[PDB]
Symmetry: C2
Subunit: 280 residues, 2 copies
Amino acid sequence: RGLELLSKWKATTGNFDESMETVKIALVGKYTNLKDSYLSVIKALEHSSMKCRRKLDIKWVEATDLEPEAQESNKTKFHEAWNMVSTADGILIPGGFGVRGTEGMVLAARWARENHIPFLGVCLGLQIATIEFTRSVLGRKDSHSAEFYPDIDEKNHVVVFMMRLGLRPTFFQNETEWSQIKKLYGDVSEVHERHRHRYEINPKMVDELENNGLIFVGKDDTGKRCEILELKNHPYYIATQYHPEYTSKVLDPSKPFLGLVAASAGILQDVIEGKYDLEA
Amino acid sequence: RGLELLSKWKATTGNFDESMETVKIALVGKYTNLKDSYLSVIKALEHSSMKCRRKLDIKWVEATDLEPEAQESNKTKFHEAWNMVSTADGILIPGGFGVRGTEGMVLAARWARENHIPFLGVCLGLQIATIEFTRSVLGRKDSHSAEFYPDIDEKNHVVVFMMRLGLRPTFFQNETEWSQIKKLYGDVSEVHERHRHRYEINPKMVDELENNGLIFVGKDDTGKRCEILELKNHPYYIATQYHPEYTSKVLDPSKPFLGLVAASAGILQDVIEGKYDLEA
């Protein structure tokens, strides 16, 4: 197992030197200038990009520069932000801190829902995948995070302090054999993942979202908590309430990020079928 | 008047050499590869750009490359099209021929409605400014041009063969003193313009559009026909049912195109106030 780990390291290293073609990903969030604040997300994209043999090019987008208000306030940076979103082969909403970036992150999720761009939402990214699908597929234009507390009736989320932390399981919903993400997990019955959330999607709404096609393909032990979503019949539109970048490893890339790179490369089928494992 | 015409020619010529800064405009339509097919539109943008002292940079966008379907069909050109739309200081829908480009031209009109980008719609561009404002501000997602005849109930337009052609008047609606476009026309009571249309916006709907803020600031002699719209409280969002590029002249630029360049330059107020007339 020592010699095999070296051989597999020489393989992932060779797959970086032997990398012929680029994948461009827009990472859209608060204060992306502070690049160490997203360090795990970058490394999770790197580990997966060496499995796909493709060169990674993260475009850093400040989420607030996408806003319709930014166009009069700071027009130049607003065009740079939108060129990055328009160029990218995939979109990534990375699980930001606090509310500020939300309005632009909605428009980045809309951009990948409508036009078939590959997408991953992490934590606040699932929250914003659900706020957007509510705000555009159900109408409901007033809907917002539970952070906007005094609106009450239109809160898209509910408090669940138990903060939920550490390695907890997540179980696939037993009918979802079509799912792109539960295929990447090798058809295993459950997964185990890290969490950092005080809010979850309001269970009252989840039947409406499931019936409209925002299928919650994974839930917790109780079945009350929204842990994964996949939009039915889109090339790759995933979100996770957990942070999968806290279990990405260089020889075993975290599956939600592997799917984002592989679909951005247009190769997702063949990665699932096994054309890119390190040893035969 | 001979010597004055030469002096005014030396002035507009000097304003091209003395041009310090660029204005970028996306012209979005069918078959923009066939650049002579939009010749008058280009010349109308050139005449106005010399009044603004600013260098013109038309981005040519094939409207069909903006479509959500183009993303799987021909992904590379779809990113080039969206980068142009995202970069531009103004959007222009030029009065295209036939239906093909419509679905992308809707998304270009939406892009300039929501984010405060300057816009001009000419003929089919007013039709698409009204289809978009219907399709996104009123909901009504099934609405379409009268060209999709067998849908009946959701047709956004009505036949009016009288084809309407040649120089006809248009009269401002007597309350619209706020209007950016009727300010560019010098507060004159009426205008005279060229037409080429078989369809007009269905009069049954126009009260709903006026009440929601898509104010039809100009109509015909009867008041039945939709000749101009301006969206209330946007920096510059105009459309014309007429083709104003068929009366643009090098010393007297056509007013709807002067407003598009001047607002793309962020100077619209000062052009209306008179900081750019050729002789004192």
